[PDB]
Amino acid sequence: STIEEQAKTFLDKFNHEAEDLFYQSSLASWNYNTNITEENVQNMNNAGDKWSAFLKEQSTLAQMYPLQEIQNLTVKLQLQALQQNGSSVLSEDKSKRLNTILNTMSTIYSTGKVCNPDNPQECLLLEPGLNEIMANSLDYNERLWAWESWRSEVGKQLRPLYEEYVVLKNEMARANHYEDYGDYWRGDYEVNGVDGYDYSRGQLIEDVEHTFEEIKPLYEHLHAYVRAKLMNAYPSYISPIGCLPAHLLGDMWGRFWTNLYSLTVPFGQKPNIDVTDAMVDQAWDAQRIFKEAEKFFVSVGLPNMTQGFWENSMLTDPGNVQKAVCHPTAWDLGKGDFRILMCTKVTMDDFLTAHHEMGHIQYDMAYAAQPFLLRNGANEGFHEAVGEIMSLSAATPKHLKSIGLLSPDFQEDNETEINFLLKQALTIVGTLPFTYMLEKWRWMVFKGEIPKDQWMKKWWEMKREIVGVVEPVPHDETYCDPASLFHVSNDYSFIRYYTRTLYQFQFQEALCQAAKHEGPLHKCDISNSTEAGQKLFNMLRLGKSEPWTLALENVVGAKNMNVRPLLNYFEPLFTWLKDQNKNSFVGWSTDWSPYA
Amino acid sequence: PNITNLCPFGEVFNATRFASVYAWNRKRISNCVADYSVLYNSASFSTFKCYGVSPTKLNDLCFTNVYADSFVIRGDEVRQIAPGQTGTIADYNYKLPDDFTGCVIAWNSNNLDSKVGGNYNYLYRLFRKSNLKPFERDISTEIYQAGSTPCNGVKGFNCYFPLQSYGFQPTYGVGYQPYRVVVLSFELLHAPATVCGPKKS
Numbered sequence: 161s162t163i164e165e166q167a168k169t170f171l172d173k174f175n176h177e178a179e180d181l182f183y184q185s186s187l188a189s190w191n192y193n194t195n196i197t198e199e200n201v202q203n204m205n206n207a208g209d210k211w212s213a214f215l216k217e218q219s220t221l222a223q224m225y226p227l228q229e230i231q232n233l234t235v236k237l238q239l240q241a242l243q244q245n246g247s248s249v250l251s252e253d254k255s256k257r258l259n260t261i262l263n264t265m266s267t268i269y270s271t272g273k274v275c276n277p278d279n280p281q282e283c284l285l286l287e288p289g290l291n292e293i294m295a296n297s298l299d300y301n302e303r304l305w306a307w308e309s310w311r312s313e314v315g316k317q318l319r320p321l322y323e324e325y326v327v328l329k330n331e332m333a334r335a336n337h338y339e340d341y342g343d344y345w346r347g348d349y350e351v352n353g354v355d356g357y358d359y360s361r362g363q364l365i366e367d368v369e370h371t372f373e374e375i376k377p378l379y380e381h382l383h384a385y386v387r388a389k390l391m392n393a394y395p396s397y398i399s400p401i402g403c404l405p406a407h408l409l410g411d412m413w414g415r416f417w418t419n420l421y422s423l424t425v426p427f428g429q430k431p432n433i434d435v436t437d438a439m440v441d442q443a444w445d446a447q448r449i450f451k452e453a454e455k456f457f458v459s460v461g462l463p464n465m466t467q468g469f470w471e472n473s474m475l476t477d478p479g480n481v482q483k484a485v486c487h488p489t490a491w492d493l494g495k496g497d498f499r500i501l502m503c504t505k506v507t508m509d510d511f512l513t514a515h516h517e518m519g520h521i522q523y524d525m526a527y528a529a530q531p532f533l534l535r536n537g538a539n540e541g542f543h544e545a546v547g548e549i550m551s552l553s554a555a556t557p558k559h560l561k562s563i564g565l566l567s568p569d570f571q572e573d574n575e576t577e578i579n580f581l582l583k584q585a586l587t588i589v590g591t592l593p594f595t596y597m598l599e600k601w602r603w604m605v606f607k608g609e610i611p612k613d614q615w616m617k618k619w620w621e622m623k624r625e626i627v628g629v630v631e632p633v634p635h636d637e638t639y640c641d642p643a644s645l646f647h648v649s650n651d652y653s654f655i656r657y658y659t660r661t662l663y664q665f666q667f668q669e670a671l672c673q674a675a676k677h678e679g680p681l682h683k684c685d686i687s688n689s690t691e692a693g694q695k696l697f698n699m700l701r702l703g704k705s706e707p708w709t710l711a712l713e714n715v716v717g718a719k720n721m722n723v724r725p726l727l728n729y730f731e732p733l734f735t736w737l738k739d740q741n742k743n744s745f746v747g748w749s750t751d752w753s754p755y756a
Numbered sequence: 757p758n759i760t761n762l763c764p765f766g767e768v769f770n771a772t773r774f775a776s777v778y779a780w781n782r783k784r785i786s787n788c789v790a791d792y793s794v795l796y797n798s799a800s801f802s803t804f805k806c807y808g809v810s811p812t813k814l815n816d817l818c819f820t821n822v823y824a825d826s827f828v829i830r831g832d833e834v835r836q837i838a839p840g841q842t843g844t845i846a847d848y849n850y851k852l853p854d855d856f857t858g859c860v861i862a863w864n865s866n867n868l869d870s871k872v873g874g875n876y877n878y879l880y881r882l883f884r885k886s887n888l889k890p891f892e893r894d895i896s897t898e899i900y901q902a903g904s905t906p907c908n909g910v911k912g913f914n915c916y917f918p919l920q921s922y923g924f925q926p927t928y929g930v931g932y933q934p935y936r937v938v939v940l941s942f943e944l945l946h947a948p949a950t951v952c953g954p955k956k957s
């Protein structure tokens with residue numbers, strides 16, 4: 161009769177038909193990932209085409225139910241999610257051109273091979289050929305050669321492609337009643353219709369700037385300390401008053417600073433918290449790693465893994481004859497089927513990764529009661545943040561002593577906590593200005609603030625101003641230096657990492673306050689606390705049914721993303737860095753003082 | 757006296773194929789001896805919830821007729837086979853009365869009713885104009901009219917096909933795996949009661 165009942169029947173047939181088509185697509189993707197064979201590729205492509213065609217037909221059919229005659233918030237949320245045109249609003253020729261451009265960028269990034277001129281007999285791919293050189297070399301000209309050669313080849317190939325990409329994506333977004341493609345990406349955090357908990361697309365940029373303004377002193381002190389240590393490592397290249405050279409940050413792009421922990425360690429003489437040898441001595445299998453992770457999740461009060469999880473997951477590398485993707489991935493296939501695909505080794509990194517991916521699985525299991533189109537995180541930040549909090553809690557020395565992996569007579573003094581916090585800062589704090597600068601640059605490119613002839617002149621100007629990283633030699637407009645990264649070249653949003661980083665420590669403070677931890681925030685473990693797990697599971701069970709602001713109210717009691725838990729987490733390190741930077745100069749100059 | 761002529765519980769529980777929830781099979785059991793302790797002491801059943809009578813005194817009481825209703829549902833839908841419940845199965849597929857005397861027996865059948873490609877032989881009604889009355893069967897395959905516009909037999913806009921299939925696959929979760937359900941309905945009517953338990957010597 162009424163429009164709302166019609167929409168509810170439509171979203172009762174949709175949920176059932178889509179759960180079946182999804183499960184089939186996901187199972188085909190799983191069979192491709194655990195078994196790389198050409199028939200599995202064909203089956204994956206067939207299932208993906210059926211899934212995409214079905215989503216196109218239901219999007220075509222969902223728009224015929226007008227939004228303003230529906231009052232139920234959940235029904236309106238599912239219909240809003242379904243009624244997005246995506247690329248369908250664009251013409252078929254331009255849509256085909258956009259798809260071709262995306263595929264060719266994927267092939268250029270994946271199969272991009274660069275080696276030294278005059279020695280072309282063998283060449284190295286990005287993974288692991290260039291990654292190992294960037295992460296382990298101490299030679300200035302070798303890192304300079306690898307960095308400049310990879311940005312020369314990849315940027316000179318991708319620059320016309322990206323120029324076409326920005327125009328096509330802007331055309332699609334303005335065809336979809338958005339200001340630009342940046343507004344389309346910011347629409348994931350848009351909340352409309354809820355009194356008090358409304359969030360706007362324009363509020364996201366202001367909140368990101370407001371949080372980064374508080375990030376900036378800690379990053380300035382960390383930057384000064386890393387600059388002094390890199391000056392010790394490389395005597396003449398780094399200036400006391402200038403920015404850091406781009407190719408010396410330990411990674412290909414500057415995404416993480418975690419590969420500089422060896423050079424910038426505060427107390428080398430003190431031991432590390434490496435527990436790899438202890439698991440080797442006790443013969444810990446990957447099954448034992450996942451059972452310990454499951455023990456951690458049952459300790460906090462969350463449900464334990466299903467029998468189908470243990471039966472159907474691949475937690476060890478299959479062998480030489482059968483090929484599989486080595487990247488750890490948690491799969492929510494649908495219909496209560498949860499799996500983890502990880503080539504688990506006996507390392508601390510794999511153990512923490514097991515905790516992280518089982519956190520992803522717990523998040524997926526929690527919203528299984530929700531309707532199919534609402535089975536996601538409230539925003540893109542929460543899904544990664546709930547895994548990163550498990551990675552935070554599992555890495556604590558209290559957790560390692562509790563599970564027996566660390567000796568009970570290990571002395572936890574201030575120096576080990578300082579160096580551990582510095583390692584966590586290099587991984588976590590160092591990615592924040594790079595993430596913010598990259599997303600702000602992409603937003604300005606999509607908005608049209610920066611003309612195409614001035615993309616790089618502004619970009620390096622942004623990098624000096626925000627990241628404090630200077631180019632080794634000037635680049636003209638024939639280069640495409642941003643698109644050398646995986647996320648930007650393959651049409652992925654990048655603000656999820658910034659939001660994930662802030663939500664991680666907000667959730668950590670909320671659960672540690674719930675668990676009544678009485679010490680430093682980085683010394684906090686959320687095991688054995690039923691109330692902390694209940695506070696987490698209240699948000700976890702909602703999924704995408706409720707606004708992310710209301711979910712954040714459910715956990716931390718705040719209606720907005722906040723930066724104070726992160727600064728509270730790194731406060732011992734912040735005081736130590738302020739003490740250590742008395743002689744040195746905090747802050748940088750945007751001039752060409754180190755090298756240009 | 758000497759007891760023989762047992763009731764055909766082998767052709768209900770150990771049947772090679774079960775019916776769908778919508779066209780649920782009803783077998784009337786009369787004039788035999790029903791040994792319920794063989795059912796109760798089995799370890800193969802996950803649900804043996806009896807409403808209105810207790811399993812211990814089933815073996816003593818005597819009934820006029822026994823209705824054995826058999827079908828296959830999901831794991832999460834077993835809870836809806838009870839008096840006073842709600843859900844797709846109770847509203848549109850199989851409805852139990854509030855004043856129900858009998859037992860609901862359910863067990864997991866992932867071994868038999870799930871295939872790797874997907875078993876689409878089992879179907880459920882997802883749409884009907886009104887809720888079902890107790891012990892009603894609807895096997896109509898008429899197109900559901902959700903809108904004012906007439907369907908005219910074609911599955912176009914706002915007009916859906918009522919019966920949907922459960923794609924039972926072995927790798928499913930325990931709440932989505934196939935469960936065979938046998939509901940025994942016991943009524944005592946003014947006719948001579950002939951379905952009695954075994955009498956001790």
Ligand SMILES: *[C@@H]1O[C@H](CO)[C@@H](O)[C@H](O)[C@H]1NC(C)=O
Pocket residue numbers: 195197482
């Ligand atoms: C992987 O694919 C090969 C291809 O023939 C097949 O023989 C093998 O059984 C498959 N293994 C698994 C675990 O699926």
Ligand SMILES: *[C@@H]1O[C@H](CO)[C@@H](O)[C@H](O)[C@H]1NC(C)=O
Pocket residue numbers: 168232233234235
């Ligand atoms: C919205 O619809 C769901 C089912 O689709 C229903 O359970 C819920 O109560 C409805 N909410 C409101 C406020 O009507």
Ligand SMILES: *[C@@H]1O[C@H](CO)[C@@H](O)[C@H](O)[C@H]1NC(C)=O
Pocket residue numbers: 223243244245248249336337
């Ligand atoms: C999707 O596209 C169709 C036609 O291209 C248009 O009528 C409809 O309004 C679009 N939907 C949205 C949400 O913009």
Ligand SMILES: *[C@@H]1O[C@H](CO)[C@@H](O)[C@H](O)[C@H]1NC(C)=O
Pocket residue numbers: 464465466467
């Ligand atoms: C999960 O926990 C329940 C109750 O603690 C237990 O019965 C069940 O066997 C556990 N699941 C697994 C796979 O061990």
Ligand SMILES: *[C@@H]1O[C@H](CO)[C@@H](O)[C@H](O)[C@H]1NC(C)=O
Pocket residue numbers: 574575578736
């Ligand atoms: C660590 O604690 C000792 C004892 O209180 C103190 O002497 C030392 O200066 C402290 N170091 C730092 C970096 O706080």
Ligand SMILES: *[C@@H]1O[C@H](CO)[C@@H](O)[C@H](O)[C@H]1NC(C)=O
Pocket residue numbers: 459562687688
């Ligand atoms: C958490 O509970 C387990 C179960 O007894 C216990 O062995 C462990 O020591 C507890 N953790 C802490 C930190 O007390």
Ligand SMILES: *[C@@H]1O[C@H](CO)[C@@H](O)[C@H](O)[C@H]1NC(C)=O
Pocket residue numbers: 765766769770798
């Ligand atoms: C059904 O099959 C089981 C399994 O072999 C058997 O033990 C039982 O006697 C059979 N009959 C009944 C009525 O349960």
